[PDB]
Design brief:
Layout (H helix, E strand, L loop, with lengths): L20 H10 L10 E8 H4 L5 H4 L5 E11 L21 H13 L5 H16 E4 L3 H16 L14 H11 L16 E3 L3 E3 L23 H21 L11 H7 L5 E6 L2 E4 L9 E4 L2 H15 L24 H10 L5 E5 L2 E6 L2 E7 L2 H4 L2 H15 L1 E2 L2 E2 L3 H15 L3 E4 L2 E4 L10 H18 L8 H4 L1 H5 L3 E7 L2 H11 L18 E5 L2 E6 L4 E6 L1 H9 L8 H16 L5 H19 L5 H4 L24 H8 L18 H8 L10 H11 L5 H13 L6 H14 L10 H9 L3
Parallel strand pairs: 6-14
Antiparallel strand pairs: 1-2, 3-7, 4-5, 6-8, 9-10, 10-11, 11-16, 12-13, 14-15, 17-18, 18-19
PDB class: transferase
Keywords: ibdv, infectious bursal disease virus, birnavirus, polymerase, VP1, VP3, activation, transferase
Assembly: monomeric
């Protein structure tokens, strides 16, 4: 019959049946997936840097190239993006399973003098992952197939819903976000990116962070952000200077300057088209053709501009469940330094129902059960109005002093009427094809906040129907109400009981008795942002362990480097596996330790500078994000696990508003009455007017909002909204229904 092996044969991936533009187009049209009429792009051409960025000429002589490549050519082209899929039928050895690890674990199991099926399970589990899975970037057929599935989440079973058509308003959503994502203040949003680098006659840097290794996007396919820094800033400068000019000229009287705007947006279409990057991961072999995650790689200028709004506000908002009463947020949670122990105490407390949120994740305890819930592809559910609501939130509570806008009408117009259209329901480039993106793109700079807002809406609706149990028809009905798909990934009955038993049943190991473990210590697999709980007798608290399935999945298929440094990367690999949770699993632990030891001894004898290589190991590791800015060595001992886990007081919260401690229930109940305050103030009205008026009438929209605010003493919001609606129509600057400024700029982006 059939041949069985201890060590799997090298897998040969199947042939990609869509590796051609003719076949891809055929498949998309077949499934009624929209293909756009292709727009072209001016060829990139060399230009002297000191002529485009004169106010940054000082940083060249005391940096970046002297010439910039700009999309300004006479001859045009249609852009092409052809990602390289690894591994493949032709080239199958890109990402081998860790056979050395498997052999070591088998070797050590054989040395143990008897029995022990509990040790053998480690071998069984690693072997099962090596067989079932493969690491790499899948296939075109998989990418395409994934695309068809989001067109389904967005337009099929439960089509996306504009939340404003459901009764929500910008302000009502913001007040939910006051609870679920509290934000503090960051220089005002009034400058082009060039003026975000100041010289004191030292230099001050106010520009967001971006990884120099990621792809630049349009118009620089095949180039990194690191190779296009000057260009990225140049294009953002140009774009914003043009927009402010347009807003300064206004509506030409009578609608003349309406062909300036369409001209500009059409010329900047490429700012709304992401590269469809195949996301590398541990996929199931059986679904190599039907499942490949995609990353929508934003054009680098679109990314710079959007994150100039989001980053400074979010990068100094460490506000969550740990440091604000009633806050459900897990934003910037870290399980080390007593982190996890504190969440477990939160679970253990008798209060229920209660909720936690992080982007597209909702954790609920109800009737002594723990429920982990995911939004079914968050991004795909997102509409433009969801994102403009996120923008409205960030500006009114991040970019405002008391209610006074700390932003231009230029930046206001970009935020409310351009950025959602660039990045939600726009387009993407795969092979040579320009095709629709349904929902928000997986890669963009507002992903976290847009998803977080989506989950916030789910929670609001959960509160509104008296907090039903998550596995009930009642809870399920929320998806119809909101057009937001979700599922239960996992639930755990008798959650408190199980968490309490961890204390009773903890086994000797590095964190209980300070010894090398003979036996695995029990856990509760919470999947709390990927973390489990276990009990440390040495510290007397709960400590994190990586979720067991994730851990063995990672062990099975290491990520690539993608002379001498190969042994050094193995030290990182194996020690980090231990550090994140391998320490709690006996065979995994020792095998990783032995293999790391052999790589270390090989390097010491060759005089390799290991200490220097590992100085910033966090960047070299798939787990590093959890260890960022802790300045800890890679060693894994009793002392290091203890030091990593030693409780540290949570840093104080940073809120730009008086701290709201009522909890989400109260704000939900107050809000269903349709009567609430304008907690946003003037900038709230400014942004309303900006959203509700034609794009080129933005300056007038603000002035009209300033007159209404001057009109008193804001109190009731709904009244305030309706009076401002009358003022906009009387000046004839308000746009017609179903022809909002947002819709206009979207249409002009797929003009051509």
């Amino acid at each position: 019959d059939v041949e069985e092996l201890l060590i799997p044969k090298v897998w040969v991936p199947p042939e990609d049946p869509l590796a051609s533009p003719s076949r891809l187009a055929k498949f998309l049209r077949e499934n009624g997936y929209k293909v756009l009429q292709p727009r072209s792009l001016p060829e990139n051409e060399e230009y002297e840097t000191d002529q485009i960025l004169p106010d940054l000429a000082w940083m060249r002589q005391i940096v970046l190239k002297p010439t910039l490549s700009l999309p300004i050519g006479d001859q045009e082209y249609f852009p092409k993006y052809y990602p390289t899929h690894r591994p493949s039928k032709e080239k199958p050895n890109a990402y081998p399973p860790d056979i050395a690890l498997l052999k070591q674990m088998i070797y050590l199991f054989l040395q143990v003098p008897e029995a022990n099926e509990g040790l053998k399970d480690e071998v069984t589990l690693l072997t099962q992952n090596i067989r079932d899975k493969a690491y790499g970037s899948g296939t075109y057929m998989g990418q395409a197939n994934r695309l068809v599935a989001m067109k389904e989440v967005a337009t099929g079973r439960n089509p996306n819903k504009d939340p404003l058509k459901l009764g929500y308003t910008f302000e009502s959503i913001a007040q939910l976000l006051d609870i679920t994502l509290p934000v503090g203040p960051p220089v005002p949003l009034t400058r082009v990116p060039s003026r975000m680098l100041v010289l004191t006659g030292e230099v001050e840097d106010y520009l967001p962070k971006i990884n120099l290794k990621s792809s630049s996007g349009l118009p620089y396919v095949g180039r990194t952000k690191g190779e296009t820094i000057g260009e990225m800033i140049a294009i953002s400068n140009q774009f914003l200077r043009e927009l402010s000019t347009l807003l300064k000229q206004g509506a030409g009287t009578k609608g003349s300057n309406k062909k300036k705007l369409l001209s500009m947006l059409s010329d900047y279409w490429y700012l709304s088209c992401g590269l469809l990057f195949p996301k590398a991961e541990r996929y199931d072999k059986s679904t190599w053709l039907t499942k490949t995650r995609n990353i929508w790689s934003a054009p680098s200028p679109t990314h710079l501009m959007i994150s100039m709004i989001t980053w400074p506000v979010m990068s100094n908002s460490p506000n969550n469940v740990l440091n604000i009463e009633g806050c459900p947020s897990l934003y910037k949670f870290n399980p080390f330094r007593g982190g996890l122990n504190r969440i477990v105490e939160w679970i253990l407390a008798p209060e229920e129902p209660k909720a936690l949120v992080y982007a597209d994740n909702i954790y609920i305890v109800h009737s002594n059960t723990w429920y982990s819930i995911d939004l079914e592809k968050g991004e795909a559910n997102c509409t433009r109005q969801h994102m403009q609501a996120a923008m409205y939130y960030i500006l009114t509570r991040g970019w405002s002093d008391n209610g006074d806008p700390m932003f231009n009408q230029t930046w206001a117009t970009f935020a409310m009427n351009i950025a959602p259209a660039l990045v939600v329901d726009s387009s993407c480039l795969i092979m040579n094809l320009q095709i629709k993106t349904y929902g928000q793109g997986s890669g963009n700079a507002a992903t976290f906040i847009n998803n977080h807002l989506l989950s916030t809406l789910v929670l609001d609706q959960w509160n509104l129907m008296r907090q039903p149990r998550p596995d009930s028809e009642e809870f399920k009905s929320i998806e119809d109400k909101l057009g937001i798909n979700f599922k239960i990934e996992r639930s755990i009955d008798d959650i408190r009981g199980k968490l309490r038993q961890l204390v009773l049943l903890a086994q000797p190991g590095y964190l209980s008795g300070g010894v090398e473990p003979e036996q695995s210590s029990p856990t509760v697999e919470l999947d709390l942002l990927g973390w489990s709980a276990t009990y440390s007798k040495d510290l007397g608290i709960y400590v994190p362990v990586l979720d067991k399935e994730r851990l063995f999945c990672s062990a099975a298929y290491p990520k690539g480097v993608e002379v001498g440094i190969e042994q050094a990367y193995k030290v990182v690999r194996y020690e980090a596996l231990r550090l994140v949770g391998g320490w709690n699993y006996p065979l995994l632990n020792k095998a990783c330790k032995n293999n790391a030891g052999a790589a270390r001894r090989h390097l010491e004898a060759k005089g390799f500078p290991l200490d220097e290589f590992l100085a910033e190991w966090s960047e070299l590791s798939e787990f590093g994000e959890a260890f960022e800015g802790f300045n800890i060595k890679l060693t894994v001992t009793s002392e290091s696990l203890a030091e990593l886990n030693k409780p540290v007081p949570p840093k104080p919260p940073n809120v730009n508003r008086p701290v709201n401690t009522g909890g989400l229930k109260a704000v939900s109940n107050a809000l269903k009455t349709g009567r609430y305050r304008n907690e946003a103030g003037l900038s709230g009205l400014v942004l309303l007017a900006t959203a509700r008026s034609r794009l080129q009438d933005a300056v007038k929209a603000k002035a009209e909002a300033e007159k209404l605010h001057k009109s008193k003493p804001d109190a009731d919001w709904f009244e305030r909204s309706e009076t401002l609606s009358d003022l906009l129509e009387k000046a004839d600057i308000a746009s017609k229904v179903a022809h909002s400024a947002l819709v206009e700029t979207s249409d002009a982006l797929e003009a051509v």
